[PDB]
């Protein structure tokens with residue numbers, strides 16, 4: 001009954017252009033079986049949304065990558081939040097939710113905004129820049145490590161460690177194998193910065209450690225929760241901002257709308273997250289036999305959810321393949337959905353908004369003026385290089 005497909009969603013050809021294969025996956029049926037990796041697949045909005053919102057049946061504690069922690073050893077100690085289920089999930093989720101709170105956003109917003117204006121002003125002096133290294137990477141690097149309370153030395157380890165994390169969710173292909181074999185120095189740096197003495201007062205990391213006395217987490221849980229922010233908190237935003245700039249570069253009419261109303265900045269970033277879905281895919285593991293989209297899935301099966309595909313499903317979206325900065329984006333799954341829905345989304349949206357605000361106010365045009373290169377990663381979608389000429393307003 002369930003269609004079997006030979007599509008490899010973790011192959012370079014798929015990364016290079018996923019959209020036709022995603023339509024093939026959607027149109028084959030609500031649930032598919034991927035013979036390449038022996039996992040179930042769901043690529044339509046309805047089923048992706050359903051799976052995300054049933055954490056009891058589709059659990060995370062057996063891992064959200066291909067590997068089933070009940071069968072294999074996780075490559076690093078499990079995340080206490082991403083790779084945990086309720087109830088163990090709940091209090092660590094609460095702590096990170098308060099660390100990354102509206103009040104915290106209120107404290108850092110003006111610095112985040114100044115840094116974005118300054119970056120755009122600096123890039124306009126150069127004119128011809130690489131929007132990945134010089135903007136999508138440089139801006140988050142200029143605010144997030146400091147907000148974490150990290151020291152200066154060793155920050156070069158952060159993006160490699162994140163690339164490693166996101167590749168390690170994937171199957172054991174060459175991307176994953178190579179990342180792991182290169183991992184040791186990046187892991188060592190990150191794990192050491194997670195210790196209380198190494199996190200500057202006032203920052204996210206220190207605030208996690210300060211929350212170890214409330215009965216929500218214990219002091220021995222705080223380093224791995226800092227580890228979560230150092231895993232998730234930089235590279236995601238890099239590819240998110242990268243996405244938004246690429247969208248503005250490819251859809252000049254939308255840049256023109258954004259210039260005319262800079263208050264559209266926050267939604268213009270949200271749409272870019274829908275449209276490019278920086279985090280493309282991840283897994284759940286079934287804890288029981290379950291009926292999903294008319295198909296029966298046994299206990300202990302991995303299920304692969306295509307977030308980027310759900311975000312382009314014409315069953316849910318009008319003109320999904322158009323970038324529309326005034327779209328009602330509410331309900332997209334680029335940040336997940338349900339109990340694990342991105343706990344860092346206020347930081348993400350803050351960085352995204354103030355960068356696109358700076359662009360809206362200072363830039364007249366964004367023209368690609370060189371070869372675009374894609375970056376391949378088992379989990380993340382984004383570019384290696386985006387040469388653009390910026391014209392000042």
Ligand code: HEM
Nearest residue numbers: 081082232233236237240334335336340342343344347348
């Ligand atoms: C555009 C940027 C981002 C995107 C697209 C993104 C995407 C996601 C998605 C899809 C999930 C759900 C994973 C799941 O359900 O298994 C998630 C969870 C999470 N994200 Fe984000 N994220 C972004 C930025 C950030 C930032 C800036 C931080 C930290 C400062 C962060 C930290 C986390 C953490 C700790 C979780 C686990 C939450 C939980 O399991 O309850 N993310 N993210």
Ligand SMILES: CCCCCCCc1ccc(C(=O)O)cc1
Nearest residue numbers: 064079082169228231232282379
């Ligand atoms: C790729 C499938 C999982 C979704 C990834 C979201 C980003 C993220 C990474 C790592 C951690 C962590 O807790 O370590 C938390 C979130």
Ligand SMILES: [Cl-]
Nearest residue numbers: 076187190191
């Ligand atoms: Cl690690």
